[PDB]
């Protein structure tokens, strides 16, 4: 169950519903199959002021390997992650 799974991905909120992100699909699966629920680390970097994070599901780790402008952001490509190397939605247009 080690290590961390990667893709180079970025969150384009005009692909989604304003209101349904990757970030909530990520805690409805979580809640129908009655796993903890997602914990993420954020960081911001000085060379740019960029952010970039990771998050842990069901003891395994997803992060992409871009920065982006903010934590939420950051966050959202984080979720996007986990969710697409698992074929599962995420809640695209
Ligand atoms: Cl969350
Ligand atoms: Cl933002």
Redesign the pocket.
């Known amino acids: 169950t080690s290590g961390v799974i990667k893709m180079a991905v970025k969150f384009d909120r005009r692909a989604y519903p304003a209101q349904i992100t990757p970030?909530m699909c990520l805690?409805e699966w979580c809640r129908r199959e009655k796993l903890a629920?997602?914990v993420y680390e954020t960081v911001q970097r000085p060379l740019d002021r960029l952010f970039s994070s990771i998050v842990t599901v069901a003891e395994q780790k997803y992060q992409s390997t871009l920065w982006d402008k903010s934590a939420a952001l950051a966050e959202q490509a984080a979720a996007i992650v986990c969710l697409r190397s698992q074929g599962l939605p995420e809640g695209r247009l």
């Open positions: 970030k805690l629920q997602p």
